[PDB]
Symmetry: D2
Subunit: 240 residues, 4 copies
Amino acid sequence: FQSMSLQGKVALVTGASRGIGQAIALELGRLGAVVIGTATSASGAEKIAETLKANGVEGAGLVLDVSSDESVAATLEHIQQHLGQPLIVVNNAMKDDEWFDVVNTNLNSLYRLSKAVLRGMTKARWGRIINIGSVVGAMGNAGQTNYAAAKAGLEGFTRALAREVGSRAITVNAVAPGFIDTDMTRELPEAQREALLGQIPLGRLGQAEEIAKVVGFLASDGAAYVTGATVPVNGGMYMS
Amino acid sequence: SMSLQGKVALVTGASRGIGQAIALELGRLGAVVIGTATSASGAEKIAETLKANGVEGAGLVLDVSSDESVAATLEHIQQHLGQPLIVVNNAEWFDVVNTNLNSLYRLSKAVLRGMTKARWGRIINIGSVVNAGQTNYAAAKAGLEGFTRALAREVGSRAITVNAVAPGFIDTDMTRELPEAQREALLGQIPLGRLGQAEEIAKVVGFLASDGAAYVTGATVPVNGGMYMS
Amino acid sequence: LYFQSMSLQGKVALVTGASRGIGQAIALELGRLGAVVIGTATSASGAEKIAETLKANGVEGAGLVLDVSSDESVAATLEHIQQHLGQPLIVVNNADEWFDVVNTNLNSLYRLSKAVLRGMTKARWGRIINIGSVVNAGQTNYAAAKAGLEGFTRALAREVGSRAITVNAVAPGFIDTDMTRELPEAQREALLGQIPLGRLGQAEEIAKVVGFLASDGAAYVTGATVPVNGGMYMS
Amino acid sequence: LYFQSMSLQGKVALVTGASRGIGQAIALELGRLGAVVIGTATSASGAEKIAETLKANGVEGAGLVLDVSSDESVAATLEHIQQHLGQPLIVVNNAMKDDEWFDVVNTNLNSLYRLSKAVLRGMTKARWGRIINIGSVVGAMGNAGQTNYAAAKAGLEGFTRALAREVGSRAITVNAVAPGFIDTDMTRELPEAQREALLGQIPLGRLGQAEEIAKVVGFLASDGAAYVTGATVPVNGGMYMS
Ligand SMILES: FC(F)(F)c1nc2ccccc2[nH]1
Ligand SMILES: FC(F)(F)c1nc2ccccc2[nH]1
C-alpha cells in the first residue's frame, strides 16, 4: 500500500495533545512518518511524547506558540537539528462582536507557520500543508457566526495558498470537521448536544479518528493532485 | 417613493470610476454625499464633481488604514452634517487581503454607532475589479464574502444591512489601458460579450441602499455579466 | 395618455403563479413600476382573481390560465399574449421526494424559458427571473431546490448572454404568510432566533428585488442568485 | 471463513463506465484494495474488455452490460449481481456548444438517481454503503465546454448533498469526485500550443492521471471515510472553474 506510505517523511502536527490533533499524530505515525506534535505547555509536550511512545511512533513532543515568530523559528530549528525538515505540516492549534479578532488571529497564525515551513518544502520540491478547521458546537448565534466565519476564511486561505505554492509540488488542503466526539463536546450541555445530533443525517457524532484518516490520505502520494480543497467531514450536517 | 432624501451617505474612494459613479447615483437619489480620497487634490475634485451635478455634500481626505484619520473624519461629518447611515467602502495576496479586511472592520465599527442610534443602516462593500491576478482576485472575493456575511449577522438585530457587490470586468482607468490580447481573452469569457459600466455597479449599490432591500443582508451580489471566476 | 417615469414603462411582463403571496406581490410591483402585467394561475378561478387584483390596483394587463408542465399550454398562452398585448420581455417564474420535485421544476423552468427566448432574441433584450422556494426533510428539500436553481440559472445565463438577455434568481428565506403567522409562540420565537434581522420577510420585500432585477440598471447582473433571507443562510 | 477488518476485502463494488480511463482505473484500484469488482459498459464489447482487464490484474469480479438510462437494464443487472455475487455495497457512478448543457445534466442526474435508488435496498439491509459519483472531466476548451462542465459540476454537488441527507440515517455515505483536467483521449489529441495555455491555468503545472482520481475514490470507499458524506472532493491540481 505504497501510495499510503509516509515512511521517510517528517510531519509536524500542531495542537497534538488531545482529540483531533492527537489522533492525527497517531495516524501519521502509523503510516510510517516521524511525528513532531506540539502543545502550548510543557505538560502537553511531555504527554505527546508519551502517547507517541506508547503507540510505537518515533518523533517528539514540543512546545510551540503559533502566535510568536520567535517560537516558530526556534522550533523549526530544533526539528531540523535533531530530525530534518518537516515536509508534512498539519495546523490544528463567546460574544457576538469577537469573531473578527479570532478569525484574523488564527489566519495570521496559519500564515506565519506556513511561510516558515515552505522554505524547506521548496528546497525538497515536495510538501503537504493541511489546515484543520474548528469543531462545531459553540453556544448561541455568536458561536454559529464565529464558526461560519472561521470556515469561510479557512477555505479562501487554503485555496489561495495552494495557488501560490502549487508549481513547487506542494499541496495545500483543509479539513472542515462537524460535530466530533472530543473533550470540548462531551462537556457541552446535554440539550445542546442533542439538538446538534438531531441535525446530523448519519445520526451520530464523528470520532477523532475519522478526521485523522482524511488527513492521512491528504498527506499521501495518492492525493498529489488534490490541492486548494476543503474536505468537509461532518456526517452530512452543513452549517452555513 | 425610494428617495434617499434626508440621508447622509459616505462613499470612500470616490474621485474616479466606480466610487465616483456610486457617489453620483446616491446624490441623484437625494442623499447628501460625502466622498473621500487619499489626497487633498482628490477631495477637491470630488467636491467639484458633486457641485457640477447638483449634489449636496463634501469631498474629504480619508486614509482607511489609520484609526486616527477614521475617527477624525467621522467627527467632522458628525459636527457638520450628521451621522452617515449609508456607508459604501470602495477604498503578497495575504497582506493585501488581510490589510483590506482590517480596514473594512475599522471603518465599519466606527460608523456602526451612528447607525445603532438611528436603528437603521446600510453598509455596502465593493469588491475589486477583475495567474497572480486571478489568485489575488479570488482571495479578495472569498474574504469579502465571509466578512460581509459575518458582520451582517452581528448587526442584524439593529435593522442595519451589510452587503457586498463583486464587480467583474468593468470599464475603468485600470481596464482602459489593458493590452488588446488580455481584453479579447476576457471578453471571450463574458457571456454578455462586453465590459460593465461603472454606472451598472452604482445602480446595484443604489438599490441595496434603498428601503426595498431591507430584507437583503449578508449577500454578495455579483455584477459580472455572467463571468464567474473562482 | 399617461406615462410612468418608472423603470418598466412600455414593457410587458409575464409572472407565473401570481394569484397569491410572493407571485401576487411581484405582479403588483412590476405594475407599479409601469409594466403591462400578465399574471398566471392553473385554474380559471385563479386567473379571474388575478385580473381583479390588477384592475383594483390600476395595473394594465390580464390574468390567464397557464400550466407550466405542458408544452401546449405554454406555446398557446405565449401566442395569446403576443397577439393581444405584445411580446413579454420580462418573465418571472414563480410557478425522499426531493429529486422528483426539483427535477420537475427545473424541466418546467427550461420549458418556459426556451419558449420566451425567441421573442427576447428578436428584441435583443430580456429579463428572466426565477423565484426559488420559501423555507430535516424540509431543509434537504430546501437546500436541493436552491443548489439546482443556482446552477441552472448560471448555465442558462451563459447560454443566452450574447443576446443581452439576463437570467437571475431570487432565493427567499422565511417569508410572512398565514402558515407562518399561525405558528405557536414557542416555535415562531425559535425560528426568528435563526434570522439575524429578527423578523420574517414581507412578500413585498421579494418583489422589490425582482423589480430591480427587471430594470435597466441591472443590465450587467446575470447568472446571479440574490438571497433575500434576512441573513439566515441554510445550505 | 475469512473475516475482514478495516478493508474492502469481501465487499462487492459496482463501477459503471469501467472500460477505459477514469472508470477502468477506479475498477482496478477497488480490486487492488480487495473488493470483488463488477465493471459495466453499454456494449458487449466493453463488458468483455472489462472482464479481461480484471482477470489480467488478478481482480475477481465481472464485466457486464448496463444501460443506466433504463429501469429494466438496472433492475436486471442488479438481480444478476445478487444471484451470482451478492449485494453491491460500493457503487461508483462513472457512466460542442453552450446550448447542450440542460439535456446532458438532466439525463445524467436522472440516471444517478435511478441507479442509486435501486442499490439502496441492499445497502439499507446491510446497514452499510458507499455511493460515489464521478463528475465529468473538462470536455472541450472554450466557452461551450466551460459552461457544460460548470453546469454538470453544480448539479452533481447539490444532488450528492441531498441524497447524502436522504440516506444518512442508514450508514450509507454519498460523495462525489470532481475531476479537472485529466490525461485522456479528449486531452491528448488537442493542439500543442493550446495545451501550454491549459497547463498555465493549473497551479500544479500538469494534467492529472486517471489513477489520481481512482485513489480518491478508493479512500472514500473505505471505513476511514465513514463520516465523510455529502462532499464533493475536487481533484484538479488547483484549477477551479465554476
Ligand atoms: F474574512 C475573514 F474570514 F475575516 C478573513 N480574514 C482574513 C485574513 C487574511 C486572509 C483572509 C481572510 N479572511
Ligand atoms: F436536483 C435535480 F432535480 F436533480 C437537478 N436537476 C437538474 C438539472 C439541471 C441542473 C441541475 C439540476 N439539479
